[PDB]
Scaffold this active site. Structure first.
Site, PDB file in Angstrom:
ATOM      1  N   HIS A 479       0.850  -1.189   0.000  1.00  0.00           N
ATOM      2  CA  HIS A 479       0.000   0.000   0.000  1.00  0.00           C
ATOM      3  C   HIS A 479       0.883   1.234   0.000  1.00  0.00           C
ATOM      4  O   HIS A 479       2.060   1.178   0.389  1.00  0.00           O
ATOM      5  CB  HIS A 479      -1.007  -0.023   1.182  1.00  0.00           C
ATOM      6  CG  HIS A 479      -0.459  -0.446   2.518  1.00  0.00           C
ATOM      7  ND1 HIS A 479       0.091   0.446   3.435  1.00  0.00           N
ATOM      8  CD2 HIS A 479      -0.430  -1.658   3.112  1.00  0.00           C
ATOM      9  CE1 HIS A 479       0.378  -0.206   4.556  1.00  0.00           C
ATOM     10  NE2 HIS A 479       0.086  -1.509   4.377  1.00  0.00           N
ATOM     11  N   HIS A 486       1.147   2.438  10.740  1.00  0.00           N
ATOM     12  CA  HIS A 486       1.733   2.403  12.069  1.00  0.00           C
ATOM     13  C   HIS A 486       1.612   3.771  12.734  1.00  0.00           C
ATOM     14  O   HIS A 486       1.287   3.838  13.929  1.00  0.00           O
ATOM     15  CB  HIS A 486       3.241   2.059  11.991  1.00  0.00           C
ATOM     16  CG  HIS A 486       3.467   0.591  11.942  1.00  0.00           C
ATOM     17  ND1 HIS A 486       3.253  -0.162  10.784  1.00  0.00           N
ATOM     18  CD2 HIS A 486       3.859  -0.276  12.905  1.00  0.00           C
ATOM     19  CE1 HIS A 486       3.529  -1.435  11.040  1.00  0.00           C
ATOM     20  NE2 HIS A 486       3.881  -1.519  12.328  1.00  0.00           N
TER      21      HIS A 486
HETATM   22 BR   LIG Z   1      -0.106  -0.573   9.369  1.00  0.00          BR
END
Ligand SMILES: [Br-]
Ligand SMILES: [Br-]
Ligand SMILES: [Br-]
Ligand SMILES: [Br-]
Ligand SMILES: [Br-]
Ligand SMILES: [Br-]
Ligand SMILES: [Br-]
Ligand SMILES: [Br-]
Ligand SMILES: [Br-]
Ligand SMILES: [Br-]
Ligand SMILES: [Br-]
Ligand SMILES: [Br-]
Ligand SMILES: [Br-]
Ligand SMILES: [Br-]
Ligand SMILES: [Ca+2]
Ligand SMILES: [Ca+2]
Ligand SMILES: [Ca+2]
Ligand code: NA
Ligand code: NA
Ligand code: NA
Ligand code: NA
Ligand code: NA
Lengths: 597, 597, 597, 99, 50
Positions: A479, A486
């Site tokens: 992606h 995160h």
């Molecule tokens: Br992630």
């Protein structure tokens, strides 16, 4: 008659509460998201060809030519259409991977390694998750991240320089940043970054406000490779919550008596009391010095979807995070909200008070009420975890539906191909001419590093390669780069924890990892850390860990942290309508102001 | 003209989706909750007194007389008013604990122990959480648990008998239920329970359907102290997910190449791979043979709010769950959804497939799509945790606003007081005459056990005591018995996991804890276990762990499991409106039927 | 944000679908219905009497004088009030039948026959069904039929002439219209009709559009007694669907193999395969030459509600429809949608393809989908039958609440009474002077025919009678003439079938009934018939069958066919909202245009 | 004043009648349908295989092996997706019949 | 040959069949199906005629 309210059924009150929260979210309004303009800017260099090249867009998975540019612009245009539609058939109709053999159906890779492993393709990870609604919090599309840096910008040159320096520094121990043995490399890193306009010249009036907020100044050993959240730049690099254990079962105060756990020392050896069992802070040890995607054919196969996930090797055992690489390993496999749940467990075990503006926080002789489901441990344990997927949907919309920024490995690919061509007097990817021109010293070190890797991997006389070495065999997830899953989850989760706990509590003893042994030592830090500061630092540790792996740039992380903070704040605001008690959360935000919710 | 739909703004679509989910929840309708009638049935025995006694209601914290009956019925009636209001001032105005010393301000306890520790009071834990609304799932008050067993019932006599046998069996190892050294006690337990009407006689036509569903038959070594969820009664007592570790980082298949973690053996020594760090399945070891609240004065102090939390002692180290007491220790401190998050982490690390009716679960060469935020690891990690607090609000409503059932310790107190009085020719608490009459052999064993404990605690010639020995120094939490927070969360969380994973997957190798050492051994079980069965068994392990600690009865746990399943199902149903994809969750329910959501 | 739709619950989607269909029907708007003005036009001829006579209105059942005019105008005015109210008590309070004997309560009839049979009265058939709503399709009152022809009009003279010629031709065989033995009568009929202004002069600019559409021109043997729907005037008089059988079970193509039913010849002997059983096309045979209501006293008793239903005689056996009378018998007792269900069964058995604009009509190797409940046999079988009652409610509103047109028998009564009086130099019912003046030759034939009937019925020297001979003993049903239940249902049902089947399919072999035997013969027709043409012809056969019985006029039938077509179209339009598939019905309308629904 | 009802147009009465019938149907509420649990219970017996067998599910039309078990579990899972979608293209993309 | 037991699904209890006899062999359980001849009158008899 005396003015009054009227009661209604519980079921209608519940319905009306839920509608009122939806109305609150609706009435915030929405903002647009603007991309940086590169997607239709860069064109195919062939004189008889009009098409965009899409070289600065995430195209991992689409088939690439020998230079790393996609072969057919329709493949990316179709990918964008599928992103905006979400239809499963339309997704399955895309072109993924390189040309396949007509007889056998096998993908034919460029690298002998990928062919010998009989690798298949991996696919995009929820390319339309940015379409998904949610029952709580700001809708994914209601909020925005600002345009990403462009390949020609001082900001990007600085970002990519930093990532190469992190890659080449992966075996440096955090506790030895200022050690004589590392002085040559550390001073090289500091001097190289200080030689770049982004760091050595301030923003100017009229620059975008987002740039002004995130721009960094003079690089020092004290801020090298750090984030900019308040708290991250004070004291040791690693948050206490990623290296220390907690108070253990059996340590307690019972009236006037103090009991001591027979396992009390475990607190200082990296064991978190996790209920009646334990979590160890010791991380698995990826093979020192082994990096990936340093060979152009293997790199292109990865860009063409070759599934190298799971290819890393490890040394036996586990240790408290010791080197830059270890932080990259930590963030390779962490389970979503893991870092923040673990911090939460430490705070709970250590008896850190909840935010005193919540109800029932006084001694029970005064309030007759203890806390658990609301305003206590169970409440924060659910809240810190539930925000994660809401934050992910928002960053997924930015990743796929808005910005589609190429991952750092792809920028390193442009740099390498450019520099190799320039050595033969040819111009390829002039978009990265500035980075190539300015980062010569760093790229020379990468070339030497890559040659050693390529030799180790079985090529006795490799072609020169200036690729950004990856900590992970597969490089980035499937992606786009901007923003980061995160970092958005870090922003949302630490927002929850700072609000829920009394996050002005000061930390009593500060630790670091020992320079000589796999153990904690008292820090020499003279100063005061707070829970909020160490939670912000934790967020910056996980977020920068991705950069140290080679898979995000600084701007991806910082802008994602802000996006996650917004998501968590919106959830808290909407949930405020569900309680009968008189209270609020005090939240110290990333910008240094406080909101009371 | 051709019939059509129209588009609207994203913001309005988000609003309308949230309202549609609220409307779905409202249109389910609501059901009443009926209590068992005891609260106004049992009366103060004083002839000149027109008050209920509340002896079968949770009154922990209100001041009790020397028999364990509350002194002033107004204290309980005010507590009930405060439960239904939620007002903080009204809560703070309640009476909590006994008379206090004018000079020191401290509570004056009955026991030398409580006085010597200068214990203070602890307060009710969110006594009005059952009033809290939620942005998702069935409203807390829309669903019901059925009336609890009454003190005079065969069901209660059976339940309390079982809890005494569990208490007296706390040092038995699970691995040794069928061992010769335990045969005398195990056969005693089995024979005693088989001597009780509940187990030895079936329900009869016309009995409440909830009784018919939860009634148990012949007790055997194979079902002793087990739950009744499908799967719990097959194979070893403990779920695989509470003793086994997982596949470790470094074990992987890359095309045709197999990589093996250098710490692969950790899987079979109770280490769950938790990201790139670990969870140890080894539980802290409470002092073997030490139980609490076996002395009437200490018991009454606890009933009067004396805060004994944290008073237990432990042996050094940790071990895989070995004894009945170890499972009680496990559930004393577990963090909310801990058991189920840990199971989820095992399933993820082991690569157990997700439910195949979710989207994008095929090989990526076919569907061009991998999963993460939706339909993948991040999705299940948030969903399994977020259901917990919604389930807790529902069970809190049942606990405090509806049923207010006394905890097992209080029933043990009525039994002890009754039996002691009867020996002197006095009738006190005739409500428990049947339990006293039928459980003589068990109560004689408890009397001997309690005398030994009371001597150990420093009383050289203790009064006879038939109290139910508690595993925890403070006995139950400060909230009513029916239902259970642990069991409702278990029900909701394992419902999520069975729906999200392909929970028909069969377990390959079954383990148990070794009889001689702190290690796993291959089980001799011949048969097949499934992920769904072992998740149900995990729910039953955590739920019955509370019973083995002395703090819940069988009916509390089973009816709470059903309530949690309803909460999770409702959340999945409402969330179904937020996705664009064509899919459903297949959920095998506790009743053996499947719902597709 | 990206524009979107939102999901809602299935139950809300079903509700909203139903409301949307109701909204579609509402938004069509409504039109008024206009009557022809006769109801208050014609007045009592008595000089001292102001009242309307109601002689051109349906008054069957109300008590009539010796001339056939109602005795008390209040009886009709009350009937009209009851029609508009629907109240059961108000209906039961009406005057029905002739004066009753005070002592016995018997109705005293005029005719010795009715008295000797002890006949009782029959009542109006759902005189307020035009008030009934319906869950689907256009509301009964939303649509209109135009004003009926007036008694003084060229159109009515032509209509009543045609009905007398049909009555006197009842024993003519369809297959012998052009035979020498019938030439004298057939040429008489053709010449008589061609002598009337309606047929021999065209409409003029400014005439009502409804008249222009339905006006007929030159009468020929080829169009004698036919309808005007497209298709009815081509090929044999009778639709193939009312004389041919179908393919039988056992005739099939299975891959490359052709199987032949052992009963295949049944197709050509009038057996429709009806599932695994059969329908025979052979009709019961009413006694040739026996007509009814040819005697004035018996006629008036029928006008006064004498219940002669069931009085007909029959010859043994059954035959394919052979004579004009046989078509009248067919429509005396047919069960609602019978003709069209039977056509549908023929089309299904014969494998006639469905409309190719429906979904899933391709070979299954291409579309993977066969049809049954939607777009297949079950769907059309329900749709063709369900439209019938919706069409009936609409025509009932026209019959009773709007037009109340007298049935043809009543017009024949006025003609007979007028002519008899004129022969004695008296003027009675001058409203029909034009018909009497113009139809002398036809009325002379009716007089001779009626005398023979009246002699056969037992009157040796009957009074001259010019009544329209009825095929049925009771004459018309007990409801007004305009429109027709049979014709409205024909219009609705054949509309469904033309839409549902591929109704441009051409017929392969055309049959007629043999001139000599009760069997089918190949037609000499040279030309092409289509399914649509033969369905329209079927509708015209059933509708004109009623005229051939003596119970409707041409305009009743044609205008009713158009009304039924509207009802069926509206049902299809509203049902279009219930399907998810992409398709439409192609409908060739009666006006020669096509609508796609 | 004397309590009363009011008349409205026939067209509005027809509309309101149809809505009232829809409301009656909506107000009955809905009930779930539970399956017997076999679909994911029975598993492919192959040890190295993590798929359901679908042997107790209707799979007529999907290609079967010589024992009557479907060859590819994806064929049935796709059939289930097409059942729930109704989309004609999705239906036409299914596997029907043998090679 | 064995009845349903208390606690069995109510739908099973309603549709469970007992002792098989020639009189109920291959028949349904709707009220009326088990009395008189196997086939309904409405699938073998004709009707009154015109
Ligand atoms: Br992630
Ligand atoms: Br309610
Ligand atoms: Br608002
Ligand atoms: Br804010
Ligand atoms: Br919007
Ligand atoms: Br709903
Ligand atoms: Br709990
Ligand atoms: Br359910
Ligand atoms: Br629904
Ligand atoms: Br409309
Ligand atoms: Br009719
Ligand atoms: Br139309
Ligand atoms: Br109207
Ligand atoms: Br209703
Ligand atoms: Ca408190
Ligand atoms: Ca996939
Ligand atoms: Ca087909
Ligand atoms: Na903890
Ligand atoms: Na704070
Ligand atoms: Na399952
Ligand atoms: Na047929
Ligand atoms: Na057609």
């Amino acid at each position: 008659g005396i003015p009054a309210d009227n009661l209604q059924s519980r079921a209608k009150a519940s319905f009306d509460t839920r509608v009122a929260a939806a109305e609150l979210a609706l009435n915030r309004g929405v903002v647009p998201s603007f991309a940086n303009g590169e997607e239709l800017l860069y064109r195919n260099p062939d004189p008889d060809n009009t098409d965009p090249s899409f070289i600065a867009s995430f195209t991992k998975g689409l088939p690439h030519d020998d230079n790393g540019a996609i072969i057919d612009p329709d493949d990316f245009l179709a990918f964008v259409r599928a992103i905006n539609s979400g239809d499963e058939k339309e997704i399955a109709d895309l072109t993924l991977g390189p040309a396949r053999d007509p007889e056998t159906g096998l993908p034919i890779w460029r690298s002998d390694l990928a062919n010998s492993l009989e690798l298949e393709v991996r696919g995009w990870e929820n390319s339309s998750a940015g379409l998904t609604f949610d029952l709580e919090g700001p809708d994914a599309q209601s909020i925005a991240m600002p345009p990403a840096p462009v390949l020609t910008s001082p900001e990007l040159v600085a970002e990519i320089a930093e990532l190469y320096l992190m890659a080449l520094g992966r075996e440096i121990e955090f506790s030895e940043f200022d050690s004589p043995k590392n002085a040559e490399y550390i001073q090289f890193a500091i001097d190289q970054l200080n030689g770049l306009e982004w760091f050595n010249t301030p923003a100017k009036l009229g620059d975008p406000p987002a740039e002004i907020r995130r721009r960094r100044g003079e690089v020092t050993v004290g801020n090298l490779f750090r984030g900019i959240l308040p708290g991250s730049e004070v004291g040791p690099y690693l948050s206490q919550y990623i290296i220390v254990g907690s108070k253990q079962i059996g340590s307690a105060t019972v009236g006037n008596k103090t009991l001591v756990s027979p396992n009390a020392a475990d607190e200082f050896d990296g064991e978190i009391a996790y209920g009646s069992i334990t979590i160890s802070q010791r991380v698995r040890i990826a093979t020192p010095g082994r990096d990936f995607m340093t060979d152009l054919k293997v790199f292109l196969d990865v860009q063409d979807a070759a599934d190298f996930r799971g290819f890393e090797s490890y040394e036996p055992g586990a240790r408290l995070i010791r080197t830059i690489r270890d932080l990259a390993t930590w963030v390779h496999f962490d389970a979503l909200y893991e870092a923040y749940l673990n911090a939460c467990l430490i705070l709970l075990a250590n008896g850190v008070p909840f935010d005193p503006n919540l109800p029932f926080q006084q001694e029970d002789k005064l309030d007759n009420q203890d806390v658990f489901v609301n305003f206590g441990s169970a409440h924060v344990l659910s809240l810190v975890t539930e925000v994660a997927t809401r934050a992910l949907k928002a960053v997924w919309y930015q990743k796929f539906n808005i910005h589609r920024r190429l991952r750092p490995e792809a920028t390193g690919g442009l740099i390498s191909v450019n520099k190799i061509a320039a050595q033969k007097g040819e111009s390829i990817f002039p978009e990265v001419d500035l980075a190539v021109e300015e980062l010569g010293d760093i790229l020379e070190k990468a070339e030497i590093s890559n040659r050693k890797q390529n030799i180790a991997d079985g090529d006795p006389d490799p072609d020169p390669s200036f690729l950004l070495p990856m900590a992970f065999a597969e490089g980035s997830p499937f992606h786009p780069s901007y923003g980061s899953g995160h970092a958005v989850v870090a922003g949302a989760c630490v927002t929850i924890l700072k609000a829920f706990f009394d996050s002005g509590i000061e930390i009593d003893q500060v630790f670091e990892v020992d320079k000589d042994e796999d153990k904690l030592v008292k820090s020499s830090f003279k100063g005061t850390l707070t829970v909020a500061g160490e939670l912000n630092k934790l967020a910056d540790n996980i977020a920068i860990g991705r950069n140290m792996a080679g898979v995000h740039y600084f701007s991806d992380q910082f802008e994602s942290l802000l996006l996650g903070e917004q998501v968590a704040i919106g959830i808290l605001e909407e949930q405020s309508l569900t309680y009968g008690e008189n209270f609020f959360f005090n939240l110290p935000k990333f910008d240094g102001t406080t909101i009371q919710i």
